[PDB]
Amino acid sequence: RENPKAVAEITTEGVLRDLMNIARVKYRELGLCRLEKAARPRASAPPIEVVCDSRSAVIERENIMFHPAMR
Amino acid sequence: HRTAAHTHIKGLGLNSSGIAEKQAAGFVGQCAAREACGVVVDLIKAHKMAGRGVLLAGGPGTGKTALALAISQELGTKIPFCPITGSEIYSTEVKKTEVLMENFRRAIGLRVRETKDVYEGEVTEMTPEEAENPLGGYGKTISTLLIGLKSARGQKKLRLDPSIYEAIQKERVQVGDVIYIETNTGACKRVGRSDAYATEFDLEAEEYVPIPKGEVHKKKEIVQDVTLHDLDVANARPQGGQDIISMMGQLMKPKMTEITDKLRMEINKVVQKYINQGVAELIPGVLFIDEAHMLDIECFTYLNKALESPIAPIVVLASNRGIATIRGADDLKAAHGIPPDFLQRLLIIPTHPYEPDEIRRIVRIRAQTEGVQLTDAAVDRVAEHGVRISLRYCLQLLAPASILARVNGRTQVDVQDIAEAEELFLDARRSANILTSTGESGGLHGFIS
Amino acid sequence: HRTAAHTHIKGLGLNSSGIAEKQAAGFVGQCAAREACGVVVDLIKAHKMAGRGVLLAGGPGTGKTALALAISQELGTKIPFCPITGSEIYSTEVKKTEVLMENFRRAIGLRVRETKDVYEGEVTEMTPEEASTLLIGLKSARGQKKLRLDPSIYEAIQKERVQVGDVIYIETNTGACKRVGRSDAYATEFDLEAEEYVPIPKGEVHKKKEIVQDVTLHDLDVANARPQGGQDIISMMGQLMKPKMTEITDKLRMEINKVVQKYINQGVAELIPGVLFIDEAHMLDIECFTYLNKALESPIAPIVVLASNRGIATIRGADDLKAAHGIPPDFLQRLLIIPTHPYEPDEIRRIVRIRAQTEGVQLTDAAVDRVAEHGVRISLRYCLQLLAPASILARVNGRTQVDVQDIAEAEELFLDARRSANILTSTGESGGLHGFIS
Amino acid sequence: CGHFAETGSFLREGTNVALGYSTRSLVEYRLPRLIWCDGGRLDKPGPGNLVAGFRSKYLNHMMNIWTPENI
Amino acid sequence: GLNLIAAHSHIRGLGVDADTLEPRPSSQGLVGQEKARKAAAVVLEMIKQGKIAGRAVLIAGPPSTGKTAIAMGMAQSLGQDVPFTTLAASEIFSLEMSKTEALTQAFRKSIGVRIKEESEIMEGEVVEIQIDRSTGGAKQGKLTIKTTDMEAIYDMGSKMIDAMTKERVMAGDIISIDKSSGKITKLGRSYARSRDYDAMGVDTKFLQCPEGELQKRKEVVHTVSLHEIDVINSRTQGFLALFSGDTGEIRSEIRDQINTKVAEWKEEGKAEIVPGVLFIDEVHMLDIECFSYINRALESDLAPIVIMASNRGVSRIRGTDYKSPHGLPLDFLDRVVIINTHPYTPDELRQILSIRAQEEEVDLTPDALALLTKIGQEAGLRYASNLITTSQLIAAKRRAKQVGVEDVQRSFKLFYDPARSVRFVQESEKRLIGNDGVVDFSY
Amino acid sequence: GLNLIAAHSHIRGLGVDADTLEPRPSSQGLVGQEKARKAAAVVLEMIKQGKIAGRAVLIAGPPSTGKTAIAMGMAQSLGQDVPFTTLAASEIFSLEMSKTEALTQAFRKSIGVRIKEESEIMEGEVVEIQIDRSKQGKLTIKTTDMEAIYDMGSKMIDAMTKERVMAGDIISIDKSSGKITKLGRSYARSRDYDAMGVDTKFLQCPEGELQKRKEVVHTVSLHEIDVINSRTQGFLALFSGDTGEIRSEIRDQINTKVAEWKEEGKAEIVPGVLFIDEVHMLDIECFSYINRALESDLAPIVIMASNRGVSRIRGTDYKSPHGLPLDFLDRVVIINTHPYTPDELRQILSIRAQEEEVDLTPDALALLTKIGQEAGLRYASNLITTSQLIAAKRRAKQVGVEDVQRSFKLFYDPARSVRFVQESEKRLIGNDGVVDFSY
Ligand SMILES: Nc1ncnc2c1ncn2[C@@H]1O[C@H](COP(=O)(O)OP(=O)(O)O)[C@@H](O)[C@H]1O
Ligand SMILES: Nc1ncnc2c1ncn2[C@@H]1O[C@H](COP(=O)(O)OP(=O)(O)O)[C@@H](O)[C@H]1O
Ligand SMILES: Nc1ncnc2c1ncn2[C@@H]1O[C@H](COP(=O)(O)OP(=O)(O)O)[C@@H](O)[C@H]1O
Ligand SMILES: Nc1ncnc2c1ncn2[C@@H]1O[C@H](COP(=O)(O)OP(=O)(O)O)[C@@H](O)[C@H]1O
């Protein structure tokens, strides 16, 4: 109920609004969002899986590892 | 390009017979130590051995680190050289024995052939198809996507699994884009727009790219260099799938984890399949633990088991300390600062102080390496330090003296510019005298004890 | 079955009058200490009293842990016995006073007698009744049954991928259900399908059985502190998301006590306070004893049994203070103290015979004599450790029983710490090439 | 660092093809169904695992302080 | 292969007569240490017999006296039948978990649950796959498979057609199908169909067709540790923490439930319990809190046998300020029997050097073996063993086929032994940084 | 019930004349300690009057001299109306937060904010939901005693839909927030279904009027308002712990708003007590923080207890009385508790025997009082339970001397135990680890 964040967004002189976005602005202004990647992982893998010779295991894999509601 | 402490070192300077040339590849002297380091290079290039230990033993400034960096050059770029100080082992994220294992497996390399099996084309149709689920509460779900890909010499219609559509969707693909798809990972890349309809008047700052030449479906092969540790990290923090765990694992903060022996053992099985399939060359390398006296008795007791592993790199230690207390074991003193039962495991390469004429040679090698053209009387001046003062103090004066000479308008350093460098920039011993004479009593102007 | 150290201890071996029999239930001697432990058993089974402390005090190998495990068997499986060492509480997750709180509540049990109505059968019908209710038909080899399903248990049946022809398990009261498989009457619905085919259930489609469920007050804490199990799937990410212990507030534990007493008043639940046993209590520090002092004053606290083998020793975390047992004298006043004394040579003989027949070893009389001699002159624990090696050696000599030859070999293959210390003293005389590390 | 289904032939593939998500781990944790399905998972109710059904209802609802009747 | 030559690679077993536990003077790569090898064989017998729980054995003796070698010999002579956990005592000082939790997990890793199960596996060469994909997909399809001995055709259910398309199963592919799960593993490509694999590169291998029946029950004997069951039950992908680590401190009531359930499976006859070994290398790196926990962990019914090695004499126990033999508190040593390893005689050094010269591809001339034996007496078994590798590399530099005395002498000259290294230190005390931090850099 | 008999169960109040504060030789379970009880009663007066912020009172005395008992009696006599945080000093050494945060929280727990509210809640069994679209609808609810039909707005029909309200459900609607809650289903529907889902429970139908306007008093700690404002659903942290080192600027806002509530009369501030037992287990950094903490308007009165003599302060190597800094002790007044006379022991052992429902013979109580004099109050107290059980083993009607004697034979007192430790020192692990296991 009492927080400057709300007021700074409604005032027309965006002074405190800009003072609260300094980090996100300068990150972007430095071009770090557009500069080529200088590194990436040399190897990549999918998650390790249980292997079980049952159908319930296959269903439960799909329910968790490909979880529809999160997805 | 920038000049650093070892920029003059190029190699061990051995003959083909393995004897050291008295001045070669940037070295002066240490010949017996350079010859021993040659036999170690032979031990590394012959892949047959695991977990042999070498100790470079000798006082500070005797070129122990120059020897290790010379080994790193005689091995060339293919072999993994993994340098650490003993002070890098104390992580806040994971136990210090984890960091040792990570460095042990970072020192074993693998070169592996990989087939990338891919689809590439201009997206010409994209049509999702979906089902009304039973009442799970999240609503309808896309059952599949049908996508049309056009290349220069063919086209496909692809019926994607919806996990690849999520790659397509999070890649913000549109009709008329050029895209790349890996059947390996299910991953997607938006390469650009087509060069068709490449009208300039977009604010979107698109890269328009040509239609992919060749067929839509391709099966290229490339050779990848990886360490065993790269595989450990990939499988401990999975990120290459399109599943929810791989997805969220890219959004979470990255953190190191105490990768189990169970994972490492099973990655040995995986890598040995690549060897038996003929797609990989195992290329074991070397771990250089500089300042190894900064390891503690738990580190050293772990190294026992780690070196007994049926695969482990060669470990080169360096220490500069006499009979000293073992860290974490204040009851125990030993030579080199190494536990006596661990020292039994190593081959020790003792490393010796330089003679005054060797110092003169090093000063001249170092001067011309830095590009400091330097008169012979000036060489003799600098080389009287190194005898009376540390060798390092000689080499550090060359840059101030060069600046002072150039400021004096000289093309080259005279004795005068060194005699000024000696005055502006003290050695530790002259400064230690200033302390003891000024801090001879306390007061407003005293040094603080 | 396997034979661990105490597996011969069957109980306290007390008379009807509570006097100890001089050899019974696999004890020899400690009669005064067994009788004292008998009164502790009565104290626990009366369940009248909170938070009484007991200390077992005496030399190593005098049976302090036999006595605590005898209590655990006099109490039976009903009463919760929670064993820890005093070193187990130095968790990295939470303050050690929280770890003590969690162990106090593991020592208090809560028993619920639940009737489970299980329907297991092939799904013969699934008829959505409303557009909420489902009707499901289930069949066994012995008849079929219809059930009216609440929309909640329906969607559980529907969240599992149950279809007509599947075999399922339902618990009527709990709402738990499982797809057991596909009925093998459909096994030729295709020639290949990724499906698991199971026989139709051959018993009754309905079974009623009564299960006496046990939980603890800590189980109620954990369930109420955070979503557990399938409630929290994002736990699969680890790091921040894994089910870390947190320093539970006593607001929660007080509010759990309120709810638990409600179900006791309904007669649904039976409260069963039990025992927290802490071995090596000398590994507790001054801050732990400072907490135990308060925590034993709460109205729920279990009976606490402590063991220590220290003499006068510094308490941990306050090297300035030396006390008997390593227990602060402040806290020692709160404890009923049971001394355990050393064993006589004749008692050592009897314990050797008891454990021989518990390992299935059999001995000549002279073999008992020689082992008992090592018990007197070296250690009871050493001589008992001779029994199994000597049996192997006798076996590979083809002998049916251990004899002096097999013990005289075992005692030379397997040294005690005393002769080993003599070797260290003779051989580690200097830091030579073949010396021991100092 | 993973398994996937290779395309064995381009000529026989045709113009319409189903792209299944084939990506799996080469690290592959074999478990018996006795553990992974038939009650070695303590939270999974069923035959054998007679505790989990009771414990789920009572600890998450009946004796759970956050249920509206308790609150 | 990926296993290189390592210090213990020559150890193939314990070298003991299985009929009598008589140690042979040398066999299976072990030389001497006969009484210690006999004792370790008696321990090995009661490990295999399983009936005895939570005994602890310390192997005590000077460095390089074969303590690890005997431990590796037991591991090689147990094999896969029994769990064998090796722990360096440094490992339990985790930042993820308290050291008693780390030490609990090590005990849990050393008990196996052995579970025997069957499944019908269908395996053969794909003769054809027809799938109509009739807008939607997976409507209907037929699979023809052959062995060398049979051919059959199958109508596929729709979720099997998804599996076939997911694995891009093709004519000529040799596949196994686990029926109850429905997973398809492509074991290879049949050689007779090689020309159809126009996309496969020339590096591709091919196989002969499977033999016998298309379908049989294959029986798998799983062994899963109590630790794995504990970790599986911790969270919704608990097993995933068996690899990355990032197990927390697993809650005690989870373990107590599992112990009850495993006792039920034993009594029901569904599973067997297989007690293993935990080997704690350099156990003196443990502190007094650890030993207090071990004392009672050993009294559990589900405790492995624990085997331990110490280099230490009468030495300071960690986490306290007093000394005891082996650096282990006497109350812990009361629970432990001790096996002693002795120093080697010169002929045993000669034999061990000979074995090590067989395990590496080295030819030693008889005088080079005699000199290395002399160096072994004077400078220790480990140093002479490292001169073997060094001499071969020097011999190869001079292109010699056999290692000569000249090569061993170069090795002895180039690489100092521990005593000469100490003597070098004791002479260079002004150039080496002392324990006082003092050092002189001048000439 | 679930409350078993504890060490301080007999302590039922502070036992003083409410007029003069003069104690009486025993009442409300307490015996003796008259000056300490009179001093405790004087502190309890200024707790209840509340205007005196941040006083610190140390209860100092030997073991078993009623320091904790008096703290319990003060809490009982203060009643439920006023906060009484009881903190062991060991609890402040949290791993999840700094010691000064942990002390701050305990301070914040001890100030109550009291609010009185009336609000309309409609509770009943749903009879029917009826809906029309062309959004509107009608709801029929019954109690045991009423049935009525309510017009539902569009948002209300959505809320009913979102929450799957059927007939036979018991629902509550807070009219102030408008939010529905489903309490369960009426037990009349126990036969409505054969199988029920895990999250379903039956209830008795609500009784009386459908919508009620109860007046309710609420008292919440300042600590609760902090943790509620700590994060978006911080109230969950009130139970799991699961809270950081809360930002000081949040507490700054909360204190300012709670002052506004007191100015506007929306709330009454109820300053209570923090009791820190074993305060000598704090360290030099705790004590130096507590100095500033006490010196604030929202500081409770802090009671604390110590049994330490001249002893080293923790986190330093010099000694001081009570184990406390003299810089800290300057801010404290001290209450001293004495040992007990045999006649006061005789009374306390009778009170314990009554609370434990043990019928001592007069000779047993006499002998037990000798033991209390010779071996301490707690030991003789613990023999009461032991002698009862031993008497029961012989089916005796009353605890005789023979049952106390056998209790005394079986269980050693601390002094007799220390003697045993000295007598057997070589059989026991010494401070230097030496032991001999042999006979
Ligand atoms: N034999 C040598 N020939 C040429 N330069 C040397 C030689 N030995 C040492 N240096 C140089 O002297 C400097 C100090 O040697 P450094 O390797 O740092 O000694 P340490 O690492 O043992 O302290 C480095 O710049 C190094 O390159
Ligand atoms: N009175 C006894 N009768 C029979 N066996 C005993 C007795 N006391 C001890 N034992 C056996 O000897 C072992 C050593 O006793 P233990 O209880 O471990 O000593 P402590 O725990 O006091 O160090 C026990 O494991 C038990 O098997
Ligand atoms: N009896 C033996 N037979 C064969 N090899 C041995 C024997 N004893 C020691 N070795 C070998 O010599 C090296 C040192 O012995 P090791 O077992 O490591 O001693 P420790 O572990 O006591 O330091 C190892 O490579 C080991 O394989
Ligand atoms: N004046 C008293 N009247 C009645 N019971 C008392 C009195 N003083 C102490 N007790 C009881 O004796 C036991 C010890 O007193 P307590 O105050 O807890 O010890 P401490 O002096 O260490 O705080 C407790 O059970 C307490 O209830």
From TrEMBL, chain C:
SMART domains registered for this protein in UniProt: AAA
Highest taxon of source: Eukaryota
Binding-site residues, ADP: A5, H6, H8, V28, P60, G61, T62, G63, K64, T65, A66, Y343, R381
ATP-binding among keywords: yes
Domain AAA+ ATPase: 50-329
Gene Ontology biological process terms, A to Z: chromatin organization; DNA repair
One family name in Pfam for this protein: TIP49_C
Residues reported in the UniProt entry to bind ATP: A5, H6, V28, G61, T62, G63, K64, T65, A66, Y343, R355, R381
Localization in the cell: Nucleus
Primary location class: nucleus
GO cellular component labels: Ino80 complex; Swr1 complex
Role of this protein: DNA helicase which participates in several chromatin remodeling complexes, including the SWR1 and the INO80 complexes. The SWR1 complex mediates the ATP-dependent exchange of histone H2A for the H2A variant H2A.Z leading to transcriptional regulation of selected genes by chromatin remodeling. The INO80 complex remodels chromatin by shifting nucleosomes and is involved in DNA repair. Also involved in pre-rRNA processing. DNA helicase participates in several chromatin remodeling complexes, including the SWR1 and the INO80 complexes.
Protein name: RuvB-like helicase
Catalytic reaction(s) noted: ATP + H2O = ADP + phosphate + H(+)
Signal sequence segment: none
Annotated EC: 3.6.4.12
Family: Belongs to the RuvB family.
Gene Ontology MF term list: ATP binding; ATP hydrolysis activity; DNA helicase activity
Keywords, in A-Z order: Activator, ATP-binding, Chromatin regulator, DNA damage, DNA repair, Helicase, Hydrolase, Nucleotide-binding, Nucleus, Transcription, Transcription regulation
TrEMBL record, chain E:
EC number: 3.6.4.12
Domain AAA+ ATPase: from-to ranges: 53-330
Top-level taxon of origin: Eukaryota
GO biological process: chromatin organization; DNA repair
The keyword NADP is annotated on this UniProt entry: no
Keyword Transcription (UniProt): yes
Location in or out of the cell: Nucleus
Residues the entry annotates as binding ADP 1: A7, H8, V31, S64, T65, G66, K67, T68, A69, Y344, R382
Key words, A-Z: Activator, ATP-binding, Chromatin regulator, DNA damage, DNA repair, Helicase, Hydrolase, Nucleotide-binding, Nucleus, Transcription, Transcription regulation
GO terms for MF: ATP binding; ATP hydrolysis activity; DNA helicase activity
Pfam families: TIP49, TIP49_C
A cellular-component GO term for this protein: Ino80 complex
Annotated ADP 4 binding sites: R296, R335
Reactions catalysed according to its record: ATP + H2O = ADP + phosphate + H(+)
Record: residues binding ADP 3: R296
Positions that bind ADP 2: H8, H10, V31, T65, T68, Y344
InterPro entries: AAA+_ATPase, P-loop_NTPase, RuvB-like, RuvB-like_C, RuvBL1/2_DNA/RNA_bd_dom, TIP49_P-loop
Summary of the function given for this chain in its UniProt record: DNA helicase which participates in several chromatin remodeling complexes, including the SWR1 and the INO80 complexes. The SWR1 complex mediates the ATP-dependent exchange of histone H2A for the H2A variant H2A.Z leading to transcriptional regulation of selected genes by chromatin remodeling. The INO80 complex remodels chromatin by shifting nucleosomes and is involved in DNA repair. Also involved in pre-rRNA processing.
Family under the similarity heading: Belongs to the RuvB family.
Listed name of the protein: RuvB-like helicase
